[PDB]
Amino acid sequence: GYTVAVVGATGAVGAQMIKMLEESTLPIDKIRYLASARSAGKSLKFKDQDITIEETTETAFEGVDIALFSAGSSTSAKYAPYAVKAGVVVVDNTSYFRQNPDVPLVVPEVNAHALDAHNGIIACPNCSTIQMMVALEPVRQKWGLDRIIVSTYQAVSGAGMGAILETQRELREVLNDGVKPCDLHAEILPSGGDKKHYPIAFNALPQIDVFTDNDYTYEEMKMTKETKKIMEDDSIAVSATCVRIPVLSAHSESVYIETKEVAPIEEVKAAIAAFPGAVLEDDVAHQIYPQAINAVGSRDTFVGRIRKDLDAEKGIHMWVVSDNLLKGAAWNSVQIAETLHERGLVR
Amino acid sequence: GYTVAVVGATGAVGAQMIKMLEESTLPIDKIRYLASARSAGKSLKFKDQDITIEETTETAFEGVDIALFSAGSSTSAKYAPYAVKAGVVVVDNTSYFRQNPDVPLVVPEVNAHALDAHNGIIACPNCSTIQMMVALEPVRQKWGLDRIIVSTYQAVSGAGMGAILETQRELREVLNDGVKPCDLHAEILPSGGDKKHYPIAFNALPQIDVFTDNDYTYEEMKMTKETKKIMEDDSIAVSATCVRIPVLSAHSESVYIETKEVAPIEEVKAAIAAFPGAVLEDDVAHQIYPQAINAVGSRDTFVGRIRKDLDAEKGIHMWVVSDNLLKGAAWNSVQIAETLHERGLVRPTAELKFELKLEH
Ligand SMILES: NC(=O)c1ccc[n+]([C@@H]2O[C@H](COP(=O)([O-])OP(=O)(O)OC[C@H]3O[C@@H](n4cnc5c(N)ncnc54)[C@H](OP(=O)(O)O)[C@@H]3O)[C@@H](O)[C@H]2O)c1
Ligand SMILES: NC(=O)c1ccc[n+]([C@@H]2O[C@H](COP(=O)([O-])OP(=O)(O)OC[C@H]3O[C@@H](n4cnc5c(N)ncnc54)[C@H](OP(=O)(O)O)[C@@H]3O)[C@@H](O)[C@H]2O)c1
Ligand SMILES: O=C(O)c1ccccc1C(=O)O
Ligand code: NA
Ligand code: NA
Ligand code: NA
């Protein structure tokens, strides 16, 4: 079997990486948990076994076959090159390598073939991008994609364990202590690395990550650029608005597309239902549609509210929901690792 | 001064109507509060005075100059026409009369002129529509509008007092009692009039109102039809997705438009800033943008995240926030009443144009 390292094992994504690995078809002989110096010496479970957390260092990757990185871009930038040098195959969940032309950016249902070209590093895309790609690839295959306009409804677990706990405390202060939402103290959201912090309780924050020079945030531009790379087509026009809402896990997206050919709605529904990783949940006569609360804990991406635009001949609207820590992060990463094993690419 | 009646004075919108009237420039000689027979006989404040709540009936409007209705579409359907026959000018917050060609559908900053043609009923548009019209009218005036695509992020207060209480209760069960969100019992949301009910706590529900035959909801189709009527242009393409989120008050909207002529983006920002009722909050270098929690309690509509589409030359994205019970309902209604007063339009109508539904 393999020796597998989880870098960032103690975080929100890390904890789900552990869960996905425990349930994986990857043959694992040895498991190692890496994090920062302040987590070193603590213990975490793998199934029934206690695993000592180790400090991530430049020489910590000896004997590792596969390393799953989910410890921030800074950690990946610094240590992933040393891992690769030592012969480790790295699956990276951060944004650092995503736009490197020698790094495949992979959603296995959509572009697993790109794994064949890897030179030691595979990048997992952004959580919001991944679920959109699972929903839209089956449509692209049959009728093409001219453009995408998306507005997201993103859960706080995407911003890490600290964000989850800040959200819970804020909500308790309002509901139990009577604090006005605008008077809440905040330290993390919308973005840990930005200057000002705002409450998320009973709010909708139109900022994920920091702003770029074109007044879209890095999150919004990630959806644009990663879509083009994953679908291998720079002609697909993509513009996004990414909003944080008071949901702990599971991202929702209002997705508008225009296809290249008119795609009959019932055929679109059947194409999505037929696509591995996508589940059609769409029966408005019985109020059936994807919901964040029902999607938590499942690896599937759920699609509904599928309907034609009222005016644009080739326009289609839909609602896409997935667990942002599973398919959006830890499951996509482990699924990459399984695909690497299944295709003889752990070399 | 005027005798003013508030129909549905005991509800979520009613509470704000009272506040907006207390703070109004309307010369009010007498206030009447109408609700259901259950509420009739009880009391509520107007400023320091106690007001006895009355039953809403066909004969409850004698002597009233202006009635603000916010007690449900059925109540408006049944009683507004009787108020008009009593000589009352009705400002209706419900959907019932909005698409009637004899009824102006008004956002005063946008189409106050339409008030001149009233026949005793003036309709207030849906809350989601109102804030979007305040944001977009200044753009339409200068560069036109070809199409709008909007996704909403709507607060629970829009669904009434019960929905507010259900939301608070669900959140407390999760946060204080450790109930999983999917195990919560719901009775009201997403729509009181539909058969199935789902939790809102830690959820995003892509259903507001019931579904129509074209697979859009009534809320989504209201945004479509109301936009075309208010802007007096049936050629504006409008398609919406309306989503309830766990916010108590203030609606937010991710709004995409394509103009008829290219609109320079800094001039778009200036046009919105210059438009009465709209406030430009847009300085991303300092993380300045509209937020629901900061808009609650203000009558203004806040607009930011304004930026060009990455590909469509005439495309523009923005983020629009307003208190859904103020500009979205109570304030827009009171503002209509003030505008009627100011333009000498508070007077009985000559001919009845609305079906009487209680002749039995
Ligand atoms: N043992 C301690 O002293 C202690 C006390 C409180 C919290 N923590 C941990 O700190 C994290 C706080 O959560 P969050 O919201 O900031 O982030 P998060 O996104 O949920 O997870 C961040 C992950 O990246 C790891 N990491 C950060 N910098 C690193 C570096 N230079 N090298 C290797 N790994 C690095 C963290 O390890 P670390 O866990 O080592 O930071 C953590 O596993 C939690 O994972 C929590 O377990 C540790
Ligand atoms: N413009 C907008 O977008 C917008 C937004 C919100 C609401 N509205 C309109 O306003 C209505 C109420 O909204 P809300 O949020 O205030 O609801 P709410 O909090 O549930 O209040 C309902 C109100 O309607 C009254 N009512 C119920 N049955 C009645 C009857 N048979 N006769 C007279 N009054 C009756 C209630 O009186 P009791 O206390 O006696 O039952 C109460 O005053 C909505 O149904 C909608 O039509 C419009
Ligand atoms: O459309 C509205 O403003 C509205 C909002 C909430 C409930 C009911 C209605 C209604 O009157 O149909
Ligand atoms: Na294109
Ligand atoms: Na202004
Ligand atoms: Na006058």
Largest interface comes to: A-B, 63 and 62 residues
Could you say which small molecules are bound to this protein?
NADP nicotinamide-adenine-dinucleotide phosphate, phthalic acid, sodium ion
Structural class of chain A: alpha/beta
Q: Report the oligomer.
A: homodimer
What CATH calls the topology of the largest domain in chain A is Dihydrodipicolinate Reductase, domain 2
Gyration radius of chain A (Cα, Å) is 20 Å
Backbone shape of chain A: globular
PDB class: oxidoreductase
Keywords: Rossmann Fold, NADP
Assembly: dimeric
Entry title: Crystal complex structure of sp-Aspartate-Semialdehyde-Dehydrogenase with Nicotinamide Adenine dinucleotide phosphate and phthalic acid
Task: Describe the model.
- 2 copies of one chain form a homodimer.
- By secondary structure, chain A is an alpha/beta fold.
- Chain A folds into 2 domains: 1-124 and 325-343, Rossmann fold (3-Layer(aba) Sandwich), CATH 3.40.50; 125-324, Dihydrodipicolinate Reductase, domain 2 (2-Layer Sandwich).
- The first copy, chain A, is 31% helix and 23% strand.
- Chain A is built from 9 helices and 13 strands.
- A 7-stranded mixed sheet of chain A has the order 3-4-2-1-5-6-7, sandwiched between helices.
- In chain A, a hairpin with a 6-residue loop joins strand 12 (301-308) and strand 13.
- In chain A, helix 1 crosses helix 9 and helix 4 (127-143) packs across helix 7.
- Chains A and B meet through strand 8, helix 5, strand 9, strand 10 and helix 8 of A and strand 8, helix 5, strand 9, strand 10 and helix 8 of B.
- The structure holds NADP nicotinamide-adenine-dinucleotide phosphate (2 copies), phthalic acid (PHT) and sodium ion (3 copies).
- One sodium ion (NA) binds at residues 146-147, 235-237 of chain A.
- It is classed as oxidoreductase.
- Keywords: Rossmann Fold, Dehydrogenase, oxidoreductase, NADP.
- The assembly is dimeric.
